Every structure is written in structure tokens, then in C-alpha cells.
Write a protein that binds this ligand. Structure first.
Ligand SMILES: *[C@@H]1O[C@H](CO)[C@@H](O[C@@H]2O[C@H](CO[C@H]3O[C@H](CO)[C@@H](O)[C@H](O)[C@@H]3O)[C@@H](O)[C@H](O)[C@H]2NC(C)=O)[C@H](O)[C@H]1NC(C)=O
Ligand SMILES: *[C@@H]1O[C@H](CO)[C@@H](O[C@@H]2O[C@H](CO[C@H]3O[C@H](CO)[C@@H](O)[C@H](O)[C@@H]3O)[C@@H](O)[C@H](O)[C@H]2NC(C)=O)[C@H](O)[C@H]1NC(C)=O
Lengths: 71, 71
């Protein structure tokens, strides 16, 4: 008897997990868009910004950035 | 005589208890085999709900959900 009862449980669970995985594949798609939100416009500048005789060299990066995203 | 009447009682009782276990196996089927599920549709969102420098961070989660079951 046991084998048929087990197969029935695993059939129905198979349908449920397969549908959930298909829905997840459709559900990913909106996240892909955000990978393109930024673009950098023109040349930026680097400037030596550290104080005289300081242990660390520290530069200053100025760039135009454009954010086309919603965040 | 005795051995044959006892063999017959155990044949009859065997039929009875075997059929009882077969009917029980058919009686399991509805409980183990409910089809349909919570389906999650598209992307959801997480939003910071935390306010006023509270000790525990709380997040809103909003998502579209479809119950295809009967409960
Ligand atoms: C950013 O500015 C610093 C000063 O504000 C400067 O430190 C001085 O460095 C000079 C000599 O610079 C040469 O040698 C160093 C190594 O010692 C190189 O890293 C550098 O590229 C040059 O070839 C030194 O005489 C002086 O005492 C330092 N301090 C001051 C107050 O002048 C950094 O060198 C400078 N970095 C860059 C990349 O320009
Ligand atoms: C997460 O969902 C909550 C409902 O489950 C929701 O509560 C409702 O809040 C609105 C007003 O929310 C505004 O103001 C809060 C600050 O108080 C902001 O965090 C929020 O972004 C909105 O600008 C209220 O009218 C309504 O009655 C509340 N309903 C319930 C059931 O509590 C939260 O606002 C929501 N959180 C965020 C961050 O959206």
C-alpha cells in the first residue's frame, strides 16, 4: 500500500515546487533593470588633497554622475 | 476438526483486517493530497519601517500573493 501513498505526496509537492520556481524566475526580472541606473558624464578630476607632511596620500575625485534610477 | 475451523476463522478475520487497512489507506488520500498553494507573484519590496532611533530595526515587506488552495 505504502508506495502509492508516498508517490501521491511527491507528485503534488513536485507540482507546487515547480510552479513556485517558475514564478520566482518571472519574479526576478524587475531587479535586473537597476543594474543600469548610473552613468558617468565627461572627464572627472583628481586633486592631491592631503595636508603637508601627512602620513597618508589622499586624493579628491570629482565626477558628474547621472542617476536614472528610482532610488 | 479443530484445526480447520481455526484456519477458517483466521481466513475470515484476515480478510476483515486486510480490508479495514485498505479502507484506511483510501481514507488517508484526502488529507495527504490537497493540491494548490500560496503562489508569490512578481517582485515584492522591503522598506525601512524603523523610526525615532528605536533599539530594534523593523522592515515593511509588501508582496503580491495568490492563494490557490481552499483554506
Ligand atoms: C601631495 O602633496 C604632498 C604635500 O602636500 C606631497 O608631499 C611632499 O612630497 C615632497 C616630494 O614629493 C616627491 O617625493 C614623494 C616621496 O617623498 C613622491 O611621493 C612624490 O610623488 C614626489 O615625487 C617632499 O619633499 C615633501 O616633504 C612632502 N611634504 C610636503 C609638505 O611638501 C606629496 O608628495 C604629494 N603627492 C603627489 C602625488 O603629488
Ligand atoms: C508598512 O506598512 C504599514 C501597514 O502594515 C504602514 O502603517 C501605516 O502607515 C500609514 C502612514 O505611513 C506613513 O508614515 C510613516 C511614518 O509614520 C512612514 O514610515 C510611511 O512611509 C508613510 O509615509 C498610516 O496612515 C496607516 O494608518 C498605517 N497602517 C497600519 C495598519 O499601521 C507603514 O506606514 C508602512 N511603512 C512604510 C515605511 O511604508
Amino acid at each position: 500500500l505504502s508506495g502509492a501513498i508516498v508517490a501521491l505526496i511527491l507528485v503534488i509537492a513536485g507540482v507546487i515546487i515547480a510552479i513556485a520556481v517558475v514564478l520566482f524566475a518571472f519574479g526576478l526580472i524587475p531587479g535586473i533593470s537597476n543594474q543600469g541606473s548610473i552613468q558617468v558624464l565627461g572627464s572627472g578630476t583628481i586633486t592631491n588633497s592631503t595636508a603637508s607632511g601627512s602620513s597618508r596620500t589622499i586624493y579628491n575625485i570629482t565626477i558628474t554622475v547621472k542617476n536614472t534610477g528610482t532610488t
